Design a protein around this ligand. Structure first.
Ligand SMILES: [Ca+2]
Ligand SMILES: [Ca+2]
Lengths: 255, 248
DNA sequence: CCGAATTCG
DNA sequence: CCGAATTCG
């Protein structure tokens, strides 16, 4: 990452299924091999557990880890050392979660710009649609509260169905979904796919765009450049790093 | 002056079913209504009614599984025809059962249904309600239309549906929303489902369309409120007894 | 047939 | 962690 790429932020967002203990160390090494290949500035992770933090400190030592909780399972934001200056951590609760979910925010400077970087793992399953929608509103409300000079990026596992974003009232006028921005490309549309991914061993074909990237920037100051899936290679154990595909995204920050 | 009972009699609950069926009819005997709208009837229950209620003409919504029925008191009600309207996307064999009848010079179209069940099937239930309301509008203006049945509705779903049309009224609302007969399915007062919690809903509803003011609800009461010898009620639902006057 | 929880496909 | 069918409190 040299002079030319200095105006770009690159990141990966990925629910890495830390609650599946089977093959977890090898699957962590798989995630870390992906981070080594693309060397993203930032990594947004969901379903991290404490042993997984240890694996990351070993196989992704060039990242500072900021976590959404101390025990159970939680999100984390990883920051590339020497590229990202960490300014503060903020955690916003979801008072009605039944699954210890919350909103993790990290304030940083990168490439000579101020960012508020957000992630969450919104309430899971169709049956908890109401709370998931309430949490999305909390997220979208927080994105709007940041100073107008700050660049806000949310990236996480939203567990959203399309009908739910409408029921939520659609995205506010100044908040954009990166996948939509890039013209809804088919190659990275689905991030959870039980036909293509066998980690859950579900004997049926269902697929969802659970993982999403939202951003709020002053008119034209933040331009998504690319969006691609990662984590599609089977590991030596014959499974994938996670039941989710990860998303690799690059964005330019423009005057 | 006409009377009727509408009641989901829970024919799919096999426990104490003979005693509960006899319990339902003991209740019908007490009030001897002109018309009875039933939901969740099963074939042997239907077979029972043809004997026990042999004094009623019995019209059914199906022959198999579970289904609705409309009983018409011979002498009082003249049966002219039955019509069944399908719900193409039902997953529960639900449909719309109508009968054309007269009492004196007064023509009626009487309708019942058991709308798609459970919170998860709200969207189909709403679609079925639109079909029902649509049908109510088709009758001649001189024909009095009454729907009475188990709608499984939540109030929000009626709103979602667009609300009742200007010329269709809910009898319970018309009577000023009396508290004593508001909830027709109540797990606190009713123990048949053995649900260890308190939920209550107004699932059973009466809708009518008449030329302005021709049909005036007079009373509405719950029935089936007494435990049977087995310590359970005739059904998990209360029945609704309604009396209305035809005013020309 | 409530909401929540559970197996198995 | 899908979703339909089933069981539980
Ligand atoms: Ca998971
Ligand atoms: Ca029933």
């Amino acid at each position: 990452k040299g002079l030319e790429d200095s105006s770009t932020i690159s990141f990966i967002t990925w629910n890495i299924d830390g609650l599946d203990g089977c093959n977890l160390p090898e699957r962590a090494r798989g995630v870390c091999s992906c981070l080594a290949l693309y060397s993203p500035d930032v990594v947004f992770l969901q379903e991290v557990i404490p042993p997984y933090c240890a694996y990351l400190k070993k196989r992704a030592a060039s990242y500072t880890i900021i976590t959404g909780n101390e025990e159970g399972y939680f999100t984390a934001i990883l920051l590339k050392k020497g590229r990202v200056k960490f300014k503060s951590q903020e955690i916003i609760p979801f008072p009605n979660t039944k699954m210890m979910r919350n909103l993790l925010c990290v304030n940083v400077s990168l490439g000579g710009n101020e960012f508020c970087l957000m992630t969450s793992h919104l309430e899971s399953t169709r049956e908890h649609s109401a709370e998931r929608i309430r949490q999305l509103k909390t997220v979208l409300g927080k994105m709007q509260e940041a100073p107008d000079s700050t660049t806000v990026i949310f990236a996480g596992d939203t567990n959203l169905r399309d009908q739910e974003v409408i029921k939520c009232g659609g995205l506010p006028d100044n908040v954009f979904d990166a996948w939509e921005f890039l013209g809804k490309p088919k190659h990275c549309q689905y991030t959870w796919d039980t036909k293509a991914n066998n980690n859950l061993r579900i004997p049926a074909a269902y697929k969802h765009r659970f993982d999403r990237i939202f951003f709020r920037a002053e008119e034209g100051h933040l331009i998504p450049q690319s969006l691609d899936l990662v984590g599609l290679e089977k590991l030596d154990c014959g499974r994938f790093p996670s039941d989710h595909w990860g998303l690799l995204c690059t964005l330019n920050v423009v005057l």
